[model samples]
Target: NPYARGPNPTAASLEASAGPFTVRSFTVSRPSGYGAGTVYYPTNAGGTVGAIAIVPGYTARQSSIKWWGPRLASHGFVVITIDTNSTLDQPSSRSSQQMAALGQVASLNGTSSSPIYGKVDTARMGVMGWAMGGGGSLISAANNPSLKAAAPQAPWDSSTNFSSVTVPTLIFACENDSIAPVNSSALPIYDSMSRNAKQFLEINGGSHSCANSGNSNQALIGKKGVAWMKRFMDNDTRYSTFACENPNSTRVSDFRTANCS
Candidate 1:
């Protein structure tokens, strides 16, 4: 595929902590609608790569979701991990900031002074987040149908009616999440989406922070996250199995997929 970069993906490759591309990062000098941002990108992605914006849950900062920056960037994406204007910001506000972060990433692409200048394919982008920020990712997908993909972890929202979202989405659920339990939050949200390629991955014995920065199941979660982005954002069929197949590992408490494969 024209958009695809990096070598053909393997389960082993995706499970690793990093990908094949050399990576670099920069802190956003002038923060925009968001609070702060750290941009990560590959030095030689071979082509303008898709951009992904990641946000943290309520009362959390960039560090909570920071691990995704280099992970996704190393796999051929420009990933921006952001801290919201207010830690208590709701999903809608976080959604706005998330889009704004992508906007700045787009703006940075044309400004020669920026490190990611001309490095991003502005039209091809994705969104990701944790907890409430995960809910924000779903809102982002629902509001901006043009977003290439979205992956949210332990998502929480007041309303579980995201039936209108059409963007390909993957929900990372923490099986034992008390803050936003899978039954009331992530699962119902996943069940509500009927019009797009969607998947639900529940981490066995996980808590609210299961998929957050310091989670221990990186091998499976990291692989799935990258594979989902590659499959939908880049339309790389090479990642089809990696993205859609039921990873029959015990670490996964539950898995379900629709409109994929």
Candidate 2:
């Protein structure tokens, strides 16, 4: 009954707050191609839950993006925040690691002794990252078109030809991103993704880490990210209001979408 869930009415608003479940975290390791990651899950989802693997930008580690773990996990998702084998790994390597992390989590679901046993909805999977890792998220969606959704923050990659990506994707663009300019990275990538449901959110005057935890727009970003994942990954139409509707806030300079609602 993993699919029985939808957005938490109180927790899904723009004024952010943790969801109803208590979050528990554990470490998961991969044999190779990636480093170990921290897994966050809800103590009681009332049923099984879907999962997401999040990677950080170049030279960054789990802490830079760990906040997404609790944010998404509490909202009925099992979130794994991972570190790259090498802190400087590019999007290509990062994409591989992102998939590896999901595979590990899926494995945990089959281990009887594991706390995550029988609690994962393997059919629904998602990936998220920041900067270069964000670009890797796109690569992951391109390589694994079956992935339910992807949300990248200030994604930076060498290529913008993710035209073949058929999974739903949401790009969190920073208007003042110095590390990965929105024009060359986020915008082009979003434009290239014409085959699937897509949304681009440009934070009015945000920087490289604009979509991360400490940003002034944390509430809006968190809600939007959760809504997109819930709508696409969970296939729960309950979040259509959040996902399909425009915030039209001053903090959001631009918002674009296709095939939503």
Candidate 3:
């Protein structure tokens, strides 16, 4: 059922809204030696607002994760989805590129024509990614002080040297992902974060791309992901329940560990 070319339209539509928000697509200026990508921005038709930059997993494009664009916008975030490379490909120079993109976004906020101008809560910015992009996001967050929170789904390589990340972070671990094995990737990063307010969630039977795919259960995990962003990024603490509070909870059993709490 997985089509290799593009994401499912049905899945993308699930995050669409009937409200006054508008979705616009544009290209972001890439750093030197890198190519540009078609970035999508979901904005409140009225004006600028808060913003969330979503970094995509390997072999996936921004369109594949377009679902989160409007969903975050509906909740008051001017969601900007970045297309890293062709087919969401990974690059060896990923860390520095992502950091540059983050800086470009900050610069965009100051432009009069930028949709994010005057709308972004410069003090409450967030970054999130899936798979390899998740790992890149962590590295980006560690270097960018502008990032207030981060959510890295099925993160690869927990030894990303996050000694500088002082912001709140939420890590999603997939029970069945082999690429970024739970214990090796998610656990170490979750435990090694210098941030004291970090949280971790393990999805039962979840795969590497479950949070952004068309799978029926994707919503279950996506809801949890959104809740984490809402709580830490938007300062809405009411949704904190999605984050594990007790290491002994049944939900934590799937990952065969009890370190989340």
Candidate 4:
């Protein structure tokens, strides 16, 4: 459970940067039997006309990725990050739950007269996450029509039923993660997403959480993720010009041999 009195170190750091991106904090009532959680929206004035919903990992709050809100906003995207139930850390179940929450957020973004309205291109929306959150984001994208694209980093499992997804997807895997090894999680999921525009990326020297921040691998993953979302969601393919040429490029080598077929 998150601390109630005030923001924790991670949350506080994220909150400090919220102002520049027009970040708005809000809450949602979990459908009938679910527990309520909070969410934050950061609007990028220069971003493309689309929006993205970011789901956080277990025991983490929407604020964990607060730094990303403004960064995505700078690229002209409206970023929404949400918190899940206190007791549930299972990515599969959380994925379904977050999808419902995302749908509600989408509705609100489209209909409400809030500042976020009109700024969002509902048809170009997508989702992104890390670790357990990444797993849920993948499952949600597979199950939800509203998600046009997804970028998941170091996911929890590859056992997701990807047959239902028709949207473009990107999965980033870490070589050293013990909790969810690339061979077991990301690779299998990539194989199952045969119908969609799927791509897999492997980062050479990072742990599960290392992919989230403070490392060169994380920076590269972030660059690729932002570019992928911009391309698939915003219909800008020019970004791919910077994509890896083969499996040996220093930046994207781990993914060079990934089976994108």
Best by lDDT: 1
lDDT of each: 0.95, 0.86, 0.60, 0.61
User: Candidate 4 has which clashing residue pairs, if any?
Assistant: 44-73, 46-76, 47-75, 47-76, 47-77, 48-76, 247-256
lDDT of 1 by residue, 144-221 (tens): 999999999999989999998999999999999999999999999999999999999999999999998889999899
lDDT: worst 10-residue window of model 1: 1-10
- Count clashing pairs, candidate 2: 0
Best by TM-score: 1
- After superposition, the stretches of candidate 4 with alpha carbons farther than 4 Å from their true spots are 1-48, 110-113, 158-163, 243-253, 256-261
RMSD of 1: 0.6
Write down the TM-score for model 2: 0.95
Expressed as tens digits, the lDDT of each residue in 85-125 for candidate 3 is 45445633455555555556667778788656665555667
Residue-wise lDDT of candidate 4 within 14-63, one digit each (tens)?
Answer: 22323234555555544322245444554445532566776667676665
Find the 10 residues in a row with the least total lDDT in model 4: 1-10
Residue-wise C-alpha lDDT for candidate 2, range 72-177, written one tens digit per residue: 8888899988889999898999999999889888989898987899989888999999999999999999999889999999999999889989999999999999
Q: What shift in Å separates residue 227 of candidate 2 from its native position after superposition?
A: 0.4
Residue 155, candidate 3: alpha-carbon lDDT: 79
Q: Higher TM-score: candidate 1 or 2?
A: 1
Model 1 residue runs over 4 Å out of place are none
